[PDB]
From a paper:
The [name] Serpin 42 Da gene (previously [name]) encodes a serine protease inhibitor that is capable of remarkable functional diversity through the alternative splicing of four different reactive centre loop exons. Eight protein isoforms of Serpin 42 Da have been identified to date, targeting the protease inhibitor to both different proteases and cellular locations. [name] is in the highly stable ‘cleaved’ conformation, with the cleaved RCL inserted into β-sheet A to form the 4th strand in the six stranded central β-sheet. [name] has a typical serpin fold comprising a mixed α-β secondary structure with an N-terminal helical region and a C-terminal β-barrel fold.
Residue numbers in the entry: 4 to 85, 89 to 190, 195 to 342, 350 to 366, 368 to 387
């Protein structure tokens, strides 16, 4: 009930963000963790007041206007994963003390760690933050927070990191992978497998979908494939007309001949513009209200929200990672051949952990690091 609502609201936030990112970065293989973004921003909301807090509640789709109830809603999920590792930490300017309620909600409900750092020594502070993020993401997310967005005016950085490594319930055979056409055409490694999978025809979306489960988990990779080679932008628009829950409830087990690219993607973005377009502008402005963060009466605002994500999909399974850092400163059979662009979601039970697009693929002919 409370759990279903949390998933529903995160799913809507997810498609909202996906839509704004796709508009901001049209030809790119977007990948992001909506869960990471919402969690990090909800932590910031605990320290917000007045219209800043209200914007965050309503723009993120949080459970209510009550900080304790909001915090508890995240605890329920975070605790359930006490394959998937999620970690929160706050990094606080040396000499500044957190307010008790902010500190208590972060520690007890968001299971957040806390550490004091010297942001005036901004290279050192960034290294501390970024090393922690690497350690929470199997070194897949590097240099999350650059030194050059931190300085003596920085007061805290809130970070969420998430790491996923799953093995397919039904793995692909490596010796069956072959180069084949991806229609943008290019030749890329295509993995082939015939199995019973949860599948749906989605004719009102002009698409089809398939779920690939991971063993020893209630996690799966949902692939939504337009029926036409050029159909992804239209599908992306139409997903707004439905819900993730309605899509996954349409799935039924059936024998499928699957072809899926062996692919990887990395994506990074500063999310201020996305948040502004989703009606959460006040937090970045000189009218921002974050007086519940620190004992100090210094007015604060958000100077950056940085998100980085990574995913690799191969014959054995999937590994994915992401992190979100928010800097706060003082104010001065059926064939299912995924051989053209598609969208995908790593979903727990309609709780989306990762969301992305495959729009362009190439086999690199150059050696590189």
């Amino acid at each position: 009930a409370a759990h279903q609502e949390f998933a529903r609201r995160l799913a809507l936030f997810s498609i909202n963000v996906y839509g704004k990112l796709s508009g901001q970065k049209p030809g790119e293989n977007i990948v992001f963790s909506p869960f990471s973004i919402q969690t990090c921003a909800a932590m910031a909301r605990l320290g917000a007041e007045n219209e800043t807090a209200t914007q965050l509640d309503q723009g993120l789709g949080l459970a209510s206007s009550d900080p304790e109830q909001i915090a508890h809603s995240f605890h329920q999920v975070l605790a359930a994963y006490q394959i998937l590792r999620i970690a929160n930490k706050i990094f606080v300017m040396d000499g500044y003390q957190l307010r008790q309620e902010f500190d208590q909600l972060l520690s007890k409900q968001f299971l957040s760690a806390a550490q004091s750092v010297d942001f005036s020594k901004n290279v050192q502070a960034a290294a501390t933050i970024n090393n922690w993020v690497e350690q929470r993401t199997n070194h897949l997310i590097k240099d999350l927070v650059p030194a050059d967005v931190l300085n003596s005016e920085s007061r805290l950085v809130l970070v969420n990191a998430i790491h996923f490594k799953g093995t397919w319930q039904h793995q692909f055979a490596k010796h069956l992978t072959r180069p084949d056409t991806f229609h943008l055409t290019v030749q890329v490694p295509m993995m082939s497998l015939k199995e019973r999978f949860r599948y749906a025809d989605l004719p009102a979306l002009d698409a089809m979908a398939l779920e690939l489960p991971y063993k020893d988990s209630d996690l799966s990779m949902l692939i939504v494939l337009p029926n036409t080679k050029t159909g992804l932008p239209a599908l992306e628009e139409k997903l707004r007309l439905t819900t993730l829950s309605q899509i996954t409830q349409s799935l039924y087990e059936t024998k499928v001949a699957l072809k899926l690219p062996r692919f990887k993607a990395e994506f990074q973005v500063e999310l201020s513009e996305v948040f502004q377009k989703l009606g959460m502008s006040r937090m970045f402005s000189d009218q921002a209200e974050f007086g519940k963060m620190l004992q100090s009466p210094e007015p604060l605002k958000v100077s950056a929200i940085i998100h980085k994500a990574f995913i690799e999909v191969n014959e054995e399974g999937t590994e994915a990672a992401a992190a979100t850092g928010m800097a706060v400163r003082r104010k001065r059979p059926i064939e299912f051949f995924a051989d053209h662009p598609f969208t995908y979601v790593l979903v727990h039970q309609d709780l989306p952990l990762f969301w992305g697009s495959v729009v362009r693929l190439e086999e690199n002919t150059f050696a590189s690091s």
